[PDB]
Structure formats: C-alpha cells, structure tokens
Subunit: 387 residues, 4 copies
C-alpha cells in the first residue's frame, strides 16, 4: 500500500536530495549528485517532478555554451523519464555579493544585478514548462536595527516584484510568482517573515493577481504558528499557489526534516485541509536528508516523504467519511459555523431582541462544545485505532 | 527631566492599573479600583487619557439606569481632570458565553450576541469622543484541529467586521477600527495571529479604509518576531491606527511588563521609528503591574512606562542628530537603499550591461557593509556613553 | 481494546478534572466538583488513584473539625472504590501571601509559614498512604533581575528541603520528595527551571537519596527541550520518582492538554522509554480539560489520556518486537553504543594505533548511520501501517 | 573612557574573529586569517589572550613537523605580544567522521578516535599554559528518537570524561575541564542541553572536582532561559570555571552576536552578578562578526564586545553603590532573603505559633514587594538617567 505514482504530483527540489551535508559546523558528508542522476532516481521512486534554483542546474559563472549543455542534458533526462518541472526559483543567497540581500540590498548595483539574474532564469523556467516561479528572500533582512530602514526596503521589494510582473506580462508568459516566507535564518530577522506578512504585501503590488504564497511547514513553525491555520488563510484569500512540505521540531534552526516527521498531528490536519479544499498544485518536498545518512538513506528519506503523505491522506479521508465523526461535527456545531451570522442584514439584527435583550446568556454558556470527544475521534483515526 | 505632560499623548487602559492580580494560579492581590480614582491618579502622573472595555466601565448585566450613572460619574472625572478617551473596545472574552469566541463562535446565536454587545459600545465610545475602536479576538481560535474550520471562521470574521463597518457608515460616525493581533493565549492558537495576518485580512473587507491594526509589543514577541519591523510594515501600508506599548521577555505567556522592560533594544528601535515616521496617535500602555506590587507599586510602574518612553525618545533623537551617525549611515549605504533600483524602467535595465554582463561581482562582494560600527554607535547613544 | 484497569496505575490530580475553567482572561465555565464525586467518576473510568494539594481537599482556613470531616468523607470514597492516593503536594501558590514565593519569599515570616503548611500536609499524606510528596515551586522566581538574589534564594531553597528531610527522617516516615520543574509562568522565570537544574540542585541537599524529580511533559517543552531525553537523564541518575503526563503544543503558556495531544511523536518515544526501562511508578495525568467542555467533555478528556497511553504502549511494544526493527537497530549500531568505549583501560587506549595513528578516518566517515530508515519503521509502527 | 587593558582579562577564540562567514546558505565572505595576525590585532585592541580548538591552530591532518612549525610560530606571536592562552578545546564536530558524535558516536571506533584526538590536544594546551580545557559536545545528540539510546549515550559520555580525568591525574597536569552546554544545532537535540543538565551530569563523574561548566549567553537563551539565573546556580555550586560571552535575540539559530547586543538587560544583570560574586576567570567572547562585515568590521565588532562589558560594569557598580538603591533593596527585603529561615532548627520552628497558628496571613499578603520601583532604579542606572 502507499506506493506513490506520478498522478499524486509529488515533487522534489534538486537541492533536497542533492544536499551534501555541509552545515554551519561541519563539512560535507556526501558527494555532489549530478542533476540527471537525481531525476532518474526520483522517477523510479514515483515522483512527478523536480524543481531547481538557477545555480543548482547551471554552475554559477558558466559560459553561454556550458549553460546550453547543462540544460540539454537535463532536458534529455526529463524526456527519458517523463518527469516535469512545475516550479523554478533563483539563488539570491549563496554568493557573497548577496550578503545584504538581493532585491533589498543597500547597494543599488546589487539590486539591479539580482533583478537581471532573476529575469534570465524566468526565461529558462518558461522554456522548461514551469507554471510557478518562487522567490525566497533569505538574505533580505538585518542583524541590527540601524542597518535597514524597513519602509525603504519594502519600497525596494515592491519595486522588484512590480518589475518582474511587468516583464512576464510584456513577454506574454503564463507563469505566476509565489513568495516563500521565513522568519529568520540566515539573517537575524527576514522581511515578510510569515504567510500573513507576505499576503499583506502582495495586496500592494501593481498586479496582485500574479502573486501568491509558497508557505513551508517548518518556516511557520519557527515562529510557533499553526501551519494549517496559515494555509487556511492563504486558501481563503485564493493565494495558495504552491507549498513546501517538510517537518520541524519547534522553534529552532530550520531543520527541513522529512515530511511527517516533526509535528505529526499538524501534518494530519494539513493533509486533511489540502485534500478537503481540493488543492491541485504540486506536493513539493523541501527537505534535507540528515547528514548522518549515506545515499541509501537519502532515497529512503525521500521515499518516506511520499509514504507519509499517502498514509495521512488515507487517515484523514477515513476521519471525514466516518458517520460517527459526522455526528460529532454536528454536536460541536461546525455546521453552524458555516452559516451566516446575519444574512437577515444589519437592521434585522438590530431589531432582533433574541440577539440581545432577551438572549439567555447563561443557557448558551452552559452548553459544552464537545471538542475533546471530536479530537479523540481524530486521534483514533490517525493512529488506526478505530476498534 | 523626563516628566510627562498631556501633550506627549500617553494613555492607559482602565484594566492596566486596575488589574487586581488574579492569574491562572492565584487569587487577587489588590482590591478593585474605581475608574474615577484611576482617572484622577493617572491625570496627576501626567497622562493624556484613558481607554476602556465596556465591562471595565459598566459592570456586566447593569440596568439602563445603573449604566447611566456609571457613565455620568466617569464623565465628571474626565471633565474635572481634562483627560480624554481616544479609544474604546469590547470585552468579548471574559464571560463564559464567549468560551468558543465572539465573532467566530460555532454557535450562531453567540455570534449575533457578540455583534449586538459590540454595537452598543460603539455608540458609547462615539459619545465619549473615541476616534479608534479596538477589536481583540482573544477567544477566536482553537485548541484542536477539528474544532474550527478556519475558512468558515474567516468568513464569519469578515461578516462581523463588514456589518460593523455598515453600522458606523450608516450612523455617520467618525470612528475607525483597529484589529489587535495575538498569536495564542487564552486559546491554543488565535486567528489572525500576527500583524501580517491582520493586515492581509483587512484587504478582503468591504471597506478596507475603515480598518487598521493595533499591534502590541509583547504579542509579536510571543511569536519571536521583530516588533519594529512589523510596525514598519504597518506604517508602510498606512494602517498603524493605534499601538499598545509594553515589555515581554521572549516566547512565553503574555507578560505585559511595563514599557522599556523586556527587550530594551527593541524599545529603542521602536521609539526611533515612531518618532521618525511622525506617528501622531496615542502612546497607549497595555501593561499589568506585577501582582507582587501594592498600590504604590502600581503608580510607580505606570510612571515608569512614560519615563522610559521619554528617555528612549531623547536617545533616539541624539542618535539621528549625531553627524558621526549620519556619516555612518552613508558608509552603510542607507542613502542608496532609499533610491529607486530602476527608475530608468525595465527596458533600460535589460539593456544595461553594467547590471549583469559587465557587473564585477567580486568587487561588489568585497565591500563591507559597516553595520557593526553603526550598531555600536547606536549602543553608545542608548547607554549615554558618547564620551 | 485499550480499556484501562487499576493495574495500569493511571492516576489523576483532583485539580485536573476539577478545574473550573478560570483562565487569566475569563471566568469559570464549570461548577466546582466535590472530591468524592471525582473519586467515584475516576474509579468508574478505570483509574488507579488520585493525588491532591492540601487546599484541593480541605478549604483553606478550615477549622480542625471541618478538616476532620473533609478527610473522613474522602477516605470513605477511597474505601468504597478501591482508589489509592500515591502522591500528595502542597498549594504554595494560590493565596496572596505566596505572591513572592513560599520557600524563597524575601519575607522570612512567609518562608516559615510555607514550611509549617507543608509539614502539616506531609502528616496527612502519610496517613492516606502516599509514597511521594511533590513540590512545585510555582512562585519561586522573579519578574525583574534585582528582586531576587539567586544564590541566596538557592540557600533558602536548600534550607527548606533539608528541614523537610530532617522532619521525615525524625518521624520515621516512608515518603520521598519529588521536585517538579517548570521554566516560567506564573513568575517570569522560575527557579530550577528544568529537570537538569532540579537534578543538579538535589545533589547539594544534606540527604540526596530522599529527593528525586517529578518532570512534566509540557514543562520541559515550554523550554523547547526533548522530554524523552530529559526523562532518560533522570532514569540514568536513578531519580525518576514520579511523572506528570500531558500534552503541549510548543513554547507558549502551560496548556496542560490531554496526554497524547501536543507532540504525538514525543509521546510515543516517552512511552517506549518508560516501558523499556521498567518505570514502575504511577502514570499520573496533570491535564486541564479545556474550558470549552461541559462535564461530559471532562470525562471524555480524562478517558482519552488513558486510552492514548495504552495505544502508544501497544505500538512501542510492536516496534521493539519487530525483527526488521531489531535488524535496523544493529544496522545503525545501537548495539555498539551500549558497549564500552575502552574497557581495556586508558593505557591500552593510548597504545592502540588503530585508534589514531592508523585509524582510517575516511572509511569511517563514509559509513551511513541508516537512521532515516529506522525512523520510518518507527513512524509506520506508530501509525499502524506495517502493510 | 572604556578602554580595555590586559588586566580586564578579555579573551577571544581564534575562530571568532577568524570566522570566514560561511553559513548554511552561503559561501565565505572573508579570507582566512593567520592565527599570528589575529594574536597581534587582538593584542593591539587590549585583549588579554586567545583560545583555540586543535584544528584552528594546526590544520587537520598535519604531519608532526608541520605541527611543530605551526605551534612555534604561534608561540613567537604570544611572546612578542604578551598574550596568554587560558583555555583550549578540541574540534570534535567539523570532520565528517564526527557526524554522529565524538564521545557518544554509535560506532565504537569513532569514540576511541575522539578520545585520542582530545588527549593529544590536552598535552598541547598544558604546554601553552591553559588552565581550562572546554568540551562542547556539538554532535552528541540525535534528529530522531530511535537513533540514540540516551542512557547508553550518557554511560559513554561519563566513560569518556572519566578517562580524561584519569589521564590528567596520571600526568600530574594542573588543568580542569569545563562542559559547554547547548540545547540544539547542529543536532536536532544535543545531550546535556543546558547548564542544569551539565551540572547534574558532573556529579556522577568519578572525580567531580575536576569538572565545571562553560555556559554561553546565547545557548541558554536558545531555550528561553534566564542566563543570569543559570550562572547564579553554577556559582552556587562552585562550578563556574569559564564563561562564553555574546548576544542572542531569542529562540532561534545560534547567532553569536557581539556581547551587549541581543538581550541588553540580561547583559547588565550578568555583569552585575559576575562582578558582585568576584568571578576571577577570563571574560571570554565567543562571537561571530556578521558576514556583512569586512576586516575593519571584524575589529570594530571585537572592540565593541569589550567596550560593552566595561560600560555595563560601570553602570552595575553605580547601581549597587547608590544609597537610594541600597534603601530600595531593604524595602524589597533582599536583606531578609539572605537570612536563614530557621536557624533556630526544626523543633523550634514546629513550636513557633507565630509561624502558623497565630501567623496573620492577610497582613503579610497586603505588604507590597516594591520591586517595580527597584527595577526602575536599575533601568535609570543602566541608561545613565539618574537626573
Ligand atoms: O525558494 C527555494 C528554496 O530556496 C532555499 O533552498 C531555501 O532554503 C528553501 O526554503 C526555499 O524553498
Ligand atoms: O483589546 C483590548 C485589550 O483587551 C484585553 O485586555 C487584552 O488582554 C489586551 O491585549 C487588549 O489590548
Ligand atoms: O505540584 C502539583 C501541581 O501543582 C500545580 O497544579 C501545577 O500547575 C502542576 O504542574 C503541579 O504538577
Ligand atoms: O567549545 C568551543 C567552541 O566550539 C565551537 O566553536 C562552538 O560553536 C562554540 O560555542 C564553543 O564555545
Ligand atoms: O525613499 C523614501 C523613504 O525615505 C526614508 O525616510 C529613508 O530615510 C523611508 O523611511 C521612506 O520609505
Ligand atoms: O460556508 C462555506 C464553507 O463551508 C466549508 O466547506 C464548511 O465545511 C468551508 O471550509 C467554506 O468557507
Ligand atoms: O547569606 C549570604 C548570601 O549573601 C549574598 O551576598 C546576599 O547579598 C548572597 O549572594 C550569598 O549566598
Ligand atoms: O549497556 C547497558 C545499557 O543497555 C541499554 O538497555 C541499551 O539497550 C541501555 O538503555 C543501558 O544504559
Ligand atoms: Mn526550511
Ligand atoms: Mn522552502
Ligand atoms: Mn499582552
Ligand atoms: Mn493589548
Ligand atoms: Mn503544566
Ligand atoms: Mn504538573
Ligand atoms: Mn553560540
Ligand atoms: Mn561557545
């Protein structure tokens, strides 16, 4: 059971399985993977596709012809396997020139360079068939309060994304942008640190319809936030364009554990939500096989990502289909939450004495919500302990 | 030095100095304060004004005539002292009926009751001259994932605020709404948990211009977020309608320490920002004198709030006026952050070979940002150690 | 399946199911429970026993004869049901007199009073057959740095516990003490904030053998610590005298969720450890049924505590009995971790050239730990997805 | 003012100022520093000394004669400048062989290698005159629960430290060990994660007198703990052998900011404590100049460490010498905290009716602690705002 196939739409970044294990306190524990080899290994495990930063696919500073050759070999592997490229992104974080940011570097020349590097990869992404272009502003931020005027920085951020929107519109490209929040690391505080901040920012862009969010499980958890709540807000706004799936154990460094590790209950409620809402985008994993692992462990970790999603999907589906759960949901008045509070309108509400003057506050207060019983039914379903 | 006067616009909630010291593990340590007495004591310390929830001023369940009498006595104290009431709010959290929320309770009758309780206090607030009406959804949330469908809850939240907006518009009242985020406590996760989430939500209301945010120092810090960054985003959006000032030591329960306690450097950078941006609203303190304190300690704690703001204001002003700091800010290219990245437009950027083909990436990378020197000048100014 | 019986040794505090739902922002949602009624309800659910603070059983300020009568009625219920009282504790936190602590209050008279209140309840506990007496220093701490000289406070803490040890020794009582850490709440920082700090402190008492720890799942998680690691250290030291079981979602206020809620994987690894190590003490639940719940929800929440332990016990047992897991544990060299590094002694180690001069560092480095495969087998067992 | 001299005993690790700026998301921004150059630059800024890991001074895998030459050149720089080497440590974290630990690696051969690498550097440290040898178990831990049996791991940890203690005793070396805790990073959870856990562990070693702690400001703050409280416990136990000074903004990745940055009030209370208790060891800075900085910024950041200590020292000293503060400390009964609760003994306490039967609980409860006034005097002193 729980065998993935390409129709489950599981995708992986090249940088995930290709992570060599260099951390801030130690050297690489694994050799570099050829992108072609990752493509084939992932196809064999049942993945749908891969994603890339520019610099994962084409070594930084490659000539135009080295570049052609890298793309050609990759494209051949995609053709041989049937793997897709639904998303791409830019590396605006590794090279030293990006030490104070890309789009919001204090140096204007760096900001211009960041835009040009990005635009060149948008052309490549469209050529490979990507529908979503992710921006992760990992260096946009500060360690000290005087270093970054945040209002000016947001003006620069909006300028950058507006220009990118003008570019795609002018070229007639069919690609949308997704902003990936993260609250900190590697900068002390990162700009647009949560899904909320990103959603609010998007509404001030010149063409807000071209921009959504790419939330990551572990990033929101680094701020102690409820990830399924955040995703529900993004879905409610119509802005869940892509998602990064992984695990995280609490408020600490960005662990990027395989999906299902970390906060397992939150993973269950995330799956429940994605599947109930009909999210139809890629189930993308942004994870790092731990540096303890050899190559066999790398592939085992990747497989476990997919396995854990398909297990949780089954459990959530059983939960929602259970008539005893359906009855519980009514006992807890989930049905009533979905009805309008005042479809009769404001004047009717104001004239309704059962809403205030004659509302029996004590009787309403005495009614239990029956949430603990509901939650235990959810636990029993997750654990497969329904007698 | 550092004596406040009413022109500094310092305000306090009645619930702040009036907090009796009941916590989840212990009984009250102080007797209840009469609102009239708080008004006079605060006027003597140099405050500008007070704020209230409905239930702080009028005991829950008062008759129409007890209500009149409470308001009359309060109004007399305001007239005797010259104190203003710039803000008011509703208690939709204390009474048991609000155990699952007000605006987003699963029970529809409770939601209607929450709206009616709110509207009655909006009329009172306008009569007392409040310009801002705060909403803190402290019970809107969940302890378990199945208890609250978050999409439906946001539909209900938007319904409630839309109706309030219709009400104020229809009455011709000159009052705006400010949403006060908090990430958790007393619910396991609270809806709209940060300034970002609140800002994004506001953009989906029918009349977004009537709604802003009332961010609180300690609340954003409960998610480990940078408070001055959050306020800069709110100012950038034009939505900083009011602010709650206090202190918080990290990610834990909501401490509500006096302003300046907690993260002192963040307090300095907040003051710097508010004063540089010309925020002209109330400097409102939402703090709890610790339960260790008697009445003399209560007034000492309140006075310290004001004192610490005026000290930090002086230090920030000295920082920004220091020519050596002005030179540092140029050395760190803050000037350049404020200039447009590409006022020449997209086509010019694309044709500019100095932005990419001929950009010397190594030379740009080698340039230091000089941020540590700048930050030490900021430290020296804060500490009054400029030789 | 998963029906508890008294032989599973599940115990509950009277304050758990008896929590009325008063939180720092709201009033009680449930009426007070008679201790006799809790005893009978818990006996019917299959619990083994109950625990109490002095003030849960005997209202503060009771006369000697009211006291007798309270104890008599409780004792009758214990006799009627077969319920035991394995643990007792003192309330040194609720009454205002304890606002700055009990054992470490700055006022010496309060400290003496705290000792006398404690000793009176130790006599009661011994009469009811308790084997463990818990001390939770919830008020021992500070909100500000100058308020508490911590060295003097630790001298006072050690003085208090030494005196209690002298008391029990002098009376010939067969009772041991267990210190329950918590890092913060209701004080800004609490003394002995983690299991580590408590263990270290115990070693400086005059009779360290009489003192152990009473760690609580949610408390260690409030500091972002791994609870099963902490318990392993306490077991290694021979100091796990009692345990508090509950759930907690990350670094925030003390939630006291039912056991199994919160961090579900950590619950699995805790059960695995307790059962593998042969912990033979009570499985005590210190939880709060959420205030959303009526009485039916209270009992459902309590039942779920027990259910979730018995499910996890079964899953952990299946994990460790699985031959494929046993083989995995060898592949990951858990066997080798259990062997002495240098049973040959220091000189032999120093003369062993295969340990250094001729150690092939590259070959050792290339070996994968196979941890991800092991962890996925653990996941599959937890979820009941072993094909 | 605030010019350091070698008598202030400020020390720096070679790895601090020598950090090249490689982080988990980016390449180095600065070239490698020769240790000789760091020694001379630091001597010019007024430092007392430097500290080293084996691998900072002697490139891993050096021959015996390269090794001699590295040590000779370093020793010459020490002789030229008058700089001391008070502390040394081992790198048991960088090389891939240490991916699962040094002392607690599951592979027994790695554990033996870790011991031999350590012993070789203890000989070097003694030759250079170090009095303290630090052990930071950065790789001792796990990402998953099944990977590390923690009891066995602690047996292995104790074995390793016992053997080191036997080694130094047998050689007659005058050097003590200090364990440096950290709660996580680069492992998901690290063993002995706080000062408490380390202190408790030390008490189970064969010769506990040879072992103390090397607490780091930012590490304890990564668990949300109060650093001055932790240090007070270490001083109370007589185990503060060395300290790492730096700054950290809350619960996140290990920032290693310059001292005084981060939580500035905690820095003030730490300085107050160190100076009041007469700590006479090195004031060692374990900080990372941010990667935004060039070499000029590196030296500015290092200088700021020292400056900020000397400013805080002056402010704390002024605080404690202020007669108005001395009077406040009596008003808050700090004097009484320092007196024994029951120097009269247990029987006298039991017979003292003023301790219980006739204690007026209400009168004691009504007395305010006056802590807020005290804390504001502390604030005013820190800020230099005493009129
Ligand atoms: O944006 C693409 C990716 O870039 C980097 O690898 C980030 O660490 C990751 O979280 C993000 O998803
Ligand atoms: O909204 C008004 C106030 O209501 C409550 O007292 C909250 O605890 C507080 O943070 C908020 O500012
Ligand atoms: O010590 C007994 C109990 O006292 C209080 O109720 C605490 O909140 C709880 O954690 C502790 O277990
Ligand atoms: O133990 C010596 C040092 O080793 C490493 O550099 C650690 O990151 C640091 O915290 C520690 O102080
Ligand atoms: O470019 C205008 C900008 O200039 C600043 O005052 C920089 O000093 C900003 O805070 C504002 O967005
Ligand atoms: O009222 C329509 C709503 O109904 C739900 O499906 C409730 O099941 C929501 O998730 C959506 O906002
Ligand atoms: O009672 C002796 C004690 O006195 C203090 O100096 C109080 O000033 C302590 O820090 C020490 O433990
Ligand atoms: O070496 C004895 C050790 O063996 C284990 O059971 C390993 O299975 C430990 O938990 C204990 O410390
Ligand atoms: Mn991540
Ligand atoms: Mn990601
Ligand atoms: Mn607050
Ligand atoms: Mn507030
Ligand atoms: Mn608890
Ligand atoms: Mn407990
Ligand atoms: Mn560190
Ligand atoms: Mn350190």
């Amino acid at each position: 059971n729980y065998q993935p196939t390409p129709e489950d739409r599981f995708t992986f970044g090249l940088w995930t399985v290709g992570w060599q294990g260099r951390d801030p306190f130690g050297d690489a524990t694994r050799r570099a993977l050829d992108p072609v080899e990752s493509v084939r290994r992932l196809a064999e495990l049942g993945a749908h596709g891969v994603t890339f930063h520019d610099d994962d696919l084409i070594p930084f500073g490659s000539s135009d012809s080295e570049r052609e050759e890298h793309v050609k070999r990759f494209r051949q592997a995609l053709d041989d396997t049937g793997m897709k490229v639904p998303m791409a992104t830019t590396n605006l974080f590794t090279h030293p020139v990006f030490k104070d940011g890309g789009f919001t570097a204090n140096d204007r020349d760096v900001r211009r360079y960041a835009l040009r590097k990005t635009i060149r990869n948008i052309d490549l992404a469209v050529e490979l068939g990507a529908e979503t272009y992710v921006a992760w502003g990992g260096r946009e931020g500060a360690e000290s309060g005087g270093a970054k005027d945040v209002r000016d920085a947001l003006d620069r951020m909006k300028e950058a994304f507006d220009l990118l929107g003008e570019y795609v519109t002018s070229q007639g490209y069919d690609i949308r942008f997704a902003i990936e929040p993260k609250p900190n690391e590697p900068r002390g505080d990162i700009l647009l640190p949560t899904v909320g901040h990103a959603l609010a920012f998007i509404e001030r862009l010149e063409r807000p319809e071209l921009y959504g969010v790419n939330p990551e499980v572990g990033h929101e958890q680094m701020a102690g936030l409820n990830f399924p709540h955040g995703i529900a807000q993004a879905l409610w706004a119509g802005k869940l364009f892509h998602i990064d799936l992984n695990g995280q154990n609490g408020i600490k460094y960005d662990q990027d554990l395989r999906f299902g590790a970390g906060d397992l209950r939150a993973a269950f409620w995330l799956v429940d939500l994605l599947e109930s809402a009909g999210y139809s985008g890629p189930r993308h994993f942004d994870f790092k096989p731990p540096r303890t692992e050899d190559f066999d462990g790398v592939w085992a970790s990747a497989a476990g990502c997919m396995r854990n999603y398909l297990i949780l999907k089954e459990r959530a589906a059983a939960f929602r289909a259970d008539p005893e759960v359906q009855e519980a949901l009514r006992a807890s008045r989930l049905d009533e939450l979905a009805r309008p509070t005042a479809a009769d309108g404001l004047q009717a509400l104001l004239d309704d004495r059962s809403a205030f003057e004659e509302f029996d506050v004590d009787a309403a207060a005495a009614r239990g919500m029956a949430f603990e019983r509901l939650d235990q039914l959810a636990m029993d379903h997750l654990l497969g302990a329904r007698g």
